[PDB]
């Protein structure tokens, strides 16, 4: 029989799911002084362009660079009350805001966690056994996850990728993320014969255990400890109540080979399969934290607290 289960997700760290990518400031304004980024209402933007300086004149200057900050306020000297839809704080914590990966939104501009995102986040747990049964596997053909509910626009922010290899090196990639401590509503259903809630909890717990004691704690006791401690609490053994959803979660979260093989075999398999993807004369993969106010509050990227309930 089919049993529905309302799902609530609280992103412990920032979670990013992309819907589009934009280069240097063309579709948005960035006031560097106030660390505030404004997204222009594009249809009102084109109406304003039709009402004022010619569109050809505006678009004759798109040759890289050309931030809208130094055009709407500097070259034209105009104010932008109607050319805003939502604002996002920016975390510049030495590589500039070259690129901004915006969060996926529906037609009306509301952010939402799209389809198949939670489905993949649950497949990465339930698929713990084998890599063979993927398409014909009746386990997920009966799993039925829904889309996210209403998310306030005020709960968005811009973060920069942070590293773990011997230091925290800033990266040029800046992405739009939901701030921590944001409630998200889902709805997941499935057949009782093929899946059960306790099976989902066991899969999540096993995935988190193999993530923590073998990779997170194991990689911490192999690289450094005082680099994280600003906070970097990283709680564990929380009854399997953790799922990692969104971009920047990590290469481990997207592959299932640490939880099917021991340390050395999985390590060598990851090295071999990733050296084929990328040609870098480097070592094992490292964590991907971030910074947020002021202190350098280290938050694990994509860390989400997953709780379930009947109906």
């Amino acid at each position: 029989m089919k049993k529905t289960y309302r799902v609530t997700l609280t992103a412990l760290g920032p979670i990013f799911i992309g819907g589009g990518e934009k280069l240097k400031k063309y579709e948005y304004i960035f006031d560097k002084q106030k660390k505030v980024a404004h997204m222009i209402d594009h249809t009102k933007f084109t109406k304003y362009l039709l009402e004022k300086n010619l569109l050809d004149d505006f678009t004759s200057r798109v040759n890289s660079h050309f931030d809208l900050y130094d055009y709407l306020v500097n070259k034209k000297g105009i104010v932008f009350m109607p050319l805003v839809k939502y604002s996002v704080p920016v975390a510049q914590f030495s590589p500039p805001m070259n690129d901004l990966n915006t969060f996926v939104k529906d037609a009306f501009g509301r952010p939402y966690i799209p389809g198949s995102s939670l489905k993949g986040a649950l497949r990465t747990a339930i698929l713990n056994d084998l890599k063979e049964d993927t398409k014909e596997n009746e386990v997920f053909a009966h799993l039925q996850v829904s889309d996210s509910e209403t998310i306030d626009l005020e709960n968005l922010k811009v973060y920069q990728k942070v590293d773990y290899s011997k230091t925290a090196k800033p990266l040029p990639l800046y992405r739009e993320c939901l701030k921590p401590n944001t409630e998200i509503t889902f709805t997941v259903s499935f057949d009782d014969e093929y899946l059960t809630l306790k099976k989902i909890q066991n899969a999540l717990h096993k995935t988190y255990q193999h993530y923590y004691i073998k990779w997170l704690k194991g990689g911490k006791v192999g690289e450094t400890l005082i680099k994280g401690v600003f906070a970097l609490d990283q709680p564990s053994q929380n009854q399997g109540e953790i799922i990692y959803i969104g971009g920047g979660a990590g290469f481990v979260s997207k592959t299932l080979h640490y939880k099917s093989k021991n340390r050395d075999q999985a390590r060598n398999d990851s090295f071999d399969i990733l050296k084929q993807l990328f040609r870098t004369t480097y070592s094992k993969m490292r964590s991907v934290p971030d910074n947020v106010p002021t202190g350098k509050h280290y938050l694990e990227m994509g860390k989400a607290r997953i709780k379930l309930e009947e109906l």
Binding site: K22, L23, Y26, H42, L55, N63, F66
Partner: protein, 138 residues
């Protein structure tokens, strides 16, 4: 019933033959991303403009009139703005729009203010996509 790619654009023919020639010329000498580099265009870098053009086509096909309404004109202005944005993003879309006279087609459609002009422009866009996928693609 006619826009200017630079030579001619008739409904009956050469709305796809000029796409032939544009794509053949692009394959004749692909864009040079950098002096010591080799580049080839991918259809994923035209997709936003294609979506906007298809939406405007859906909006305008249900009109029993020749001149496009003010909202449709604002949509075409948006199409041109998105062309500029997505051309400035990756400077190979710049080469694609320059060699295909796609911005020129936008300007001609804006000037003509006729439904059949935009219909022929959409036909040329479809021809460009088709013949890019035929010879090249990816």
């Amino acid at each position: 019933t006619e826009l200017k790619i630079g030579n001619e654009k008739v409904n009956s023919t050469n709305f796809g033959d000029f796409a032939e020639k544009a794509i053949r010329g692009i394959n004749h000498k692909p864009f040079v991303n950098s002096k010591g580099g080799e580049q080839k265009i991918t259809t994923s870098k035209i997709r936003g403009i294609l979506e906007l053009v298809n939406k405007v086509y859906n909006r305008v096909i249900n009109t029993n009139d020749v001149e496009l309404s003010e909202n449709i004109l604002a949509d075409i202005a948006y199409i041109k703005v998105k062309i500029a944005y997505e051309s400035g993003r990756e400077p190979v879309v710049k080469d694609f729009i320059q060699r295909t006279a796609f911005t020129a087609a936008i300007t001609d459609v804006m000037n003509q203010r006729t439904r059949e002009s935009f219909l022929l422009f959409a036909r040329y866009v479809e021809s460009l996509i088709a013949y890019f996928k035929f010879y090249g693609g990816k």
